[PDB]
Structures are given as C-alpha cells and as structure tokens.
Amino acid sequence: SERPSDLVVNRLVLFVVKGTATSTHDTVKPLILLEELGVPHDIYVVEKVSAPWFSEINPHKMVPAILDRSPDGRDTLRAWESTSTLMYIADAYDKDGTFGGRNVQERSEINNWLTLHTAALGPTAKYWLYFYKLHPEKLPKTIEKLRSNITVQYDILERRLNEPGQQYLALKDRPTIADIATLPFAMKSTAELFGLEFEKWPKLQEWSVRMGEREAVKRAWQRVAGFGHGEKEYGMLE
Amino acid sequence: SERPSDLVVNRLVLFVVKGTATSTHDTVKPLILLEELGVPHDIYVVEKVSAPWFSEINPHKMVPAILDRSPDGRDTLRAWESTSTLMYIADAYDKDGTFGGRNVQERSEINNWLTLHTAALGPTAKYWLYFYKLHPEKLPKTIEKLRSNITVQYDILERRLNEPGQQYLALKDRPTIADIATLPFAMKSTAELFGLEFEKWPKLQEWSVRMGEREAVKRAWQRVAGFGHGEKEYGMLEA
Numbered sequence A: 001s002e003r004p005s006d007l008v009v010n011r012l013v014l015f016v017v018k019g020t021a022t023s024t025h026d027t028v029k030p031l032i033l034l035e036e037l038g039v040p041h042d043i044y045v046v047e048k049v050s051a052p053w054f055s056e057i058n059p060h061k062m063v064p065a066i067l068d069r070s071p072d073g074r075d076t077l078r079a080w081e082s083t084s085t086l087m088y089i090a091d092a093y094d095k096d097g098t099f100g101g102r103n104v105q106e107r108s109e110i111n112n113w114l115t116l117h118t119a120a121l122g123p124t125a126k127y128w129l130y131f132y133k134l135h136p137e138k139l140p141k142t143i144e145k146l147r148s149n150i151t152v153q154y155d156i157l158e159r160r161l162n163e164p165g166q167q168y169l170a171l172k173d174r175p176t177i178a179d180i181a182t183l184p185f186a187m188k189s190t191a192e193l194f195g196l197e198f199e200k201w202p203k204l205q206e207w208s209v210r211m212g213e214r215e216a217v218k219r220a221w222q223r224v225a226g227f228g229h230g231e232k233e234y235g236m237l238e
Numbered sequence B: 001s002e003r004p005s006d007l008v009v010n011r012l013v014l015f016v017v018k019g020t021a022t023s024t025h026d027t028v029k030p031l032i033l034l035e036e037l038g039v040p041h042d043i044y045v046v047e048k049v050s051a052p053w054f055s056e057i058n059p060h061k062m063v064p065a066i067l068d069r070s071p072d073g074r075d076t077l078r079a080w081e082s083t084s085t086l087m088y089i090a091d092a093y094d095k096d097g098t099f100g101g102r103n104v105q106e107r108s109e110i111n112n113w114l115t116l117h118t119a120a121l122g123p124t125a126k127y128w129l130y131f132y133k134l135h136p137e138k139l140p141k142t143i144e145k146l147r148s149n150i151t152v153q154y155d156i157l158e159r160r161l162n163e164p165g166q167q168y169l170a171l172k173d174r175p176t177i178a179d180i181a182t183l184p185f186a187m188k189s190t191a192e193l194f195g196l197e198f199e200k201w202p203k204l205q206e207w208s209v210r211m212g213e214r215e216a217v218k219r220a221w222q223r224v225a226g227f228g229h230g231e232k233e234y235g236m237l238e239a
C-alpha cells in the first residue's frame, strides 16, 4: 500500500524494530557491514512488520530489510533476509571484496560458511527460540533436538577454528560476511540463552571476542540497542 | 584422513548419494546449473557421508558437496550446502551472469529469493522430512507446524508469481539460481509428499511446470535418480 510520508530513499535505508535483547540478532548483521565499510545509510524503525506497505518491501514481513537507489539511479533496489542484506551491501559497496571476497577461491569458502549459517545454525536457532518462547504449547523433545543441533553447529565452527592459522571462519587473514552472519548466534550471551556453556568451544569463544573487539561491531551493537528509544519512537530516525 | 583411491579432481567433482525420491532434492540443484551451463564435471556417489574423508570436504557431512580445481589450476577448492554449490558454479562458470545475475539490480532480487529458500522453505522442509521419517519418535504437533510453515512459504512464492510479468521468482525474463534452488521444494510431487494440494497455488504450479519443461532440468532429474544404481554402486562414476 501507500508508503509512510517520512519514508524517502536518498541513500541506503535499513529497516529495524525497537531495540531489545530478542529483536536485534539479525538487524545487527547488515549494520555491522555498513559500519565496517562506512556506507552512508538511514535507519527506519518499523512499528508493525505486519503493515501492508512493509510487506511490499519484504514479503516475509520481518527486519532487517533494505531500500536503496540502484547504481544508475533508474530503480529502487530492495534486500530482505539478513544474509541477502549482507550480499547486497557487499555487492553494491564492497567493490574491493574486503568482506565479500576478492577471487573465486575466497568466495568459495565465504559462501560455504555464510550458507552454513543461513541454512543450518540460523534457522535451527530461530526454530529453537520459536518453540521455546513463542509456540502456544511447549514441546520439550523438539526443543532438545534443536538445542542438540546447535551444539553440532558449534562443533563444526570449533573444528574449523582449530585448523592451523584459521583466525576467522572463511579466510585465515580477515573477517568476511560469513563471520558477520555467524557472530550474533555464536557468542557467550546467545550460548547462555540456549542453556550451553560457551567455554566448551574455546576457539569459537576466542573468535567471538576477536570479532567483538572490532570498532564497527561495537558501534553496531550500541546503535541497534538504541533504535526507537531516542527522540523518535517509530519512522525515519535523525 | 585417507581419500578413496578413485577420488581425483581433474575437473568439478559433484558428491551425491544413491538416488531415491528423498535423496536428490538438494544434489539436483547444482546438477541443474551444471547441465544449464554445460560445465564438464564428474559424479562421486558417497556410500557413507559419516566417513572421516568426506567430513574433510563437507564438515556438515551431507551432499551435495563439490571439489574443483582453482581458476589457475594449481589448487583445489570446495563448495558445500546446496545454495553455496549454486553460488560457486555461477561464480566460476557463469561469467555472463545468465543464472547468477548480470548487475547489482538483478543480483539484489536473485539473492532475496535464493536466501528466502536457503533460510525458510529449505530448512523448514528438511526439518519436516527429518521429524516425519528419520526421528526415532513421531512428533505430530512439530510435523504439523512445519507443514503449516511450508504453506506460508508457498503463499509468498504465489504472491510474487501473481505480480505483472513476473514469469520467474527473481527476474521477469529468465530463470536464475533462485528458481533452481526453489524448484525441488516447490513442485507437485514434493507438495504431495508434504500432503498438500499444489493446485491451491496456481501461479507457483505453472512456474514449476515452466521450469520442469527446460531440457537441463529434465536431464538433471533423469541423471540424479540413476546415480548409484548403475554398474558402479559407490565411488567415482564412469562417463
């Protein structure tokens, strides 16, 4: 339907919701990359993701979502699903491939570890959270199986980070969109939410701290928590 | 670990298992794109995905997986997760971006619909199949919720294919890796396996038929069924 009056696309617009402990694990992903690359962007706090105008941007009716001017300015582009928002930002703004990958060999590993998160840990974690908190009935056997699957995903990330010189998931030398996608679901606070001892994956914990010490990541976590708690509650932030 | 004697990487090697109705819906995806682009490749039929040598290729211990030579031909690289195998094959072999997308605009929509399948329909369908067939105990409330989530994904795809001129999921004009990734989980036979009536999503059904009519798609479906049922059951198949 008709867009809100304050929704204008002069630059990349990242769509988020009010910052809470449970609302920021996916929206933080594109924000980390925007902060890493220093991309000019606006923040739009969505009051209701069920709103018809928003389903025209993201048919899956969730944040994060992006509206942006196409390189030639002929079209308004959109990105939705948190992994797709990372792919878009990398494609449009990371022309060096510092986070997207510079060659076929780099991208091969980046896309392996990015897709592993997109297909396995990400959806498993979101099904765990749904059945644990959101489902009207509690199904403990389903929850236990999903928690078990999370430990297997942590085992895989741990095995990778135990390989000689492998400081990051995809590339030995530097973090990539694979690392950004994985971090919010592979840190101590999220491990504790799942009822897991994160010290049981030492190389994964080290990696999460290494990622956490990055200035862009610190800025992203600060800002995503604050969205919708400033002077403006909903709509285009200033 | 120790590789099997017959595993050599002289070109792209696609790792599959013995063809059944429920063993081919992810392995067929890279095979469709290989057939579309006419990429030279070998097929390796894995007997046990639990084999230590295989986990060195794919730590997730599943098919599809790819071993291939690097562009220069000095080194060997790998792709695993079906979506990743599509991204790799497009990156290495689809230089025109016929299926990968030719510009930032095309790739924005290709990645939206590809990631929707990778994150939503794909994992939901796999968890449905797991709880329905593989889990030692049948959990009908879990299976029903997953089946319900599949109908929501079908609703999203139907909405997209009801938009004016939108013949394919990502692009209006031609199919992409987004369409290839989606097809095996959005076709009549799969809809019947889930216990759904696929005619409830008319534009989605028409799209699945349009995709199914493509020669490359037919060849991949025909080939993926036969892997491990020929004169060689497991290991590197003979062309």
Ligand SMILES: [Cl-]
Residues within 6 Å of the ligand: A138, A139, A140, A141, A142, A143, B139, B142
């Ligand atoms: Cl249960």
Ligand code: NA
Residues within 6 Å of the ligand: B203, B206, B207
């Ligand atoms: Na049609």
